[PDB]
Structure 1
Amino acid sequence: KKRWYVVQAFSGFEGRVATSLREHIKLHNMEDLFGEVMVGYVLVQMVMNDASWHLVRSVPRVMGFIGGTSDRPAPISDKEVDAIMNRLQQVGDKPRPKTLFEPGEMVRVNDGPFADFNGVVEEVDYEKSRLKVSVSIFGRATPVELDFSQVEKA
């Protein structure tokens, strides 16, 4: 049975740390002691022998494990690791797709002449990447189209 552990790398070289880790596994052929490697923190399916611990800390650009102690480092509480990974993935879409999607949802404007005003998105357009929200100008909610980054979720 292989349990999970958390590895700290130099933040920014993380994919290269993951590749070098897979390659050190297939060099020192402890293939039965490593399951996966998930992506500044690298998740490793592993078991705990001191040989495999020295292996992971001899992988370059790796600081060390993160646990209660350095003698017997600590598996994984996985309290919101999935949600952290979800965020990492979502970020991609949130930026690339920028799916402007909101209805009856209140938003916030911080761009253009509508800056410093709130309103609701009566219509949303993920394909056109535009949100239809009206901003109470002189009381009159002036339905205007704002980008996801042009306005903030309320």
Structure 2
Amino acid sequence: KKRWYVVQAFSGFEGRVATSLREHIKLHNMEDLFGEVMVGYVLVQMVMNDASWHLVRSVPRVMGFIGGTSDRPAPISDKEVDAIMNRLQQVGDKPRPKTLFEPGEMVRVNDGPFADFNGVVEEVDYEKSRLKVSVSIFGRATPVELDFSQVEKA
């Protein structure tokens, strides 16, 4: 059974640290003692012998493990590892705004000169895909038409 550990590298050379780590594994052929390498911190599926510990710290541009102590360093305490599987890829995924297209519902504007302003949708047009919301500009409400993505639901 191989448990996870956290490695610190010089932040910026991290892919080169990962490649050099895979290559040191396939040099010193402790192939049964390493599972993966995930990407300033590098995640390593590993077991703990002092030989493999010296191996990972003899990989260049690696400072050391991060744990409770340096004698017996600590398996990454990611209790939500199942949630980290769903977090993988979702971290690098953006969303989209959806204006509250309903009479009297407040919305938010984040596009055009009306960006950074809130207002209410007095009228909605699903067929024309347009929301009728006015913005409190200099006091007077400024009824303007904004798309669902142009404004966010408040």
TM-score normalized by the length of structure 2:
0.65
* Residues in 1 aligned to 2:127 and 2:13: alpha-carbon distance in whole angstroms: 34
CA deviations over 1:37-60 (Å, ceiling 9, x no partner): 111111111011111011101111
Return the offset for 1:92. Answer: 3.4
* Residues in 2 aligned to 1:128 and 1:27: alpha-carbon distance in whole angstroms: 64
CA deviations over 1:103-125 (Å, ceiling 9, x no partner): 99987556642243235899999
Contact 1:107 1:133 in 2 (8 A): yes
Q: Provide structure 1 residue ranges, at least 5 long, that are not aligned to the other structure.
A: none
Q: What is the aligned length?
A: 154
Q: CA RMSD in A?
A: 5.6
Moved more, 20-29 or 119-128: 119-128
Contact 2:121 2:133 in 1 (8 A): yes
Cα gap change, 1:63/1:148 in structure 2, threshold over 3 Å: closer, same or farther? farther
State which structure, 1 or 2, has the greater radius of gyration over its C-alpha atoms. 2
Moved more, 98-107 or 79-88: 98-107
* Residues in 2 aligned to 1:131 and 1:109: alpha-carbon distance in whole angstroms: 11
Return the offset for 1:146. Answer: 7.9
Moved more, 65-74 or 8-17: 8-17
Contact 1:105 1:121 in 2 (8 A): yes
Contact 1:100 1:130 in 2 (8 A): no
Contact 2:99 2:147 in 1 (8 A): no
Return the offset for 1:101. Answer: 14
Match for residue 124 of structure 2?
124
* Residues in 1 aligned to 2:67 and 2:105: alpha-carbon distance in whole angstroms: 41
TM-score normalized by the length of structure 1:
0.65
* Residues in 2 aligned to 1:127 and 1:83: alpha-carbon distance in whole angstroms: 39
Cα gap change, 1:97/1:112 in structure 2, threshold over 3 Å: closer, same or farther? closer
Contact 1:93 1:99 in 2 (8 A): no
Cα gap change, 1:80/1:122 in structure 2, threshold over 3 Å: closer, same or farther? farther
Instruction: Name the SS for the 2:92 alignment partner.
Output: helix
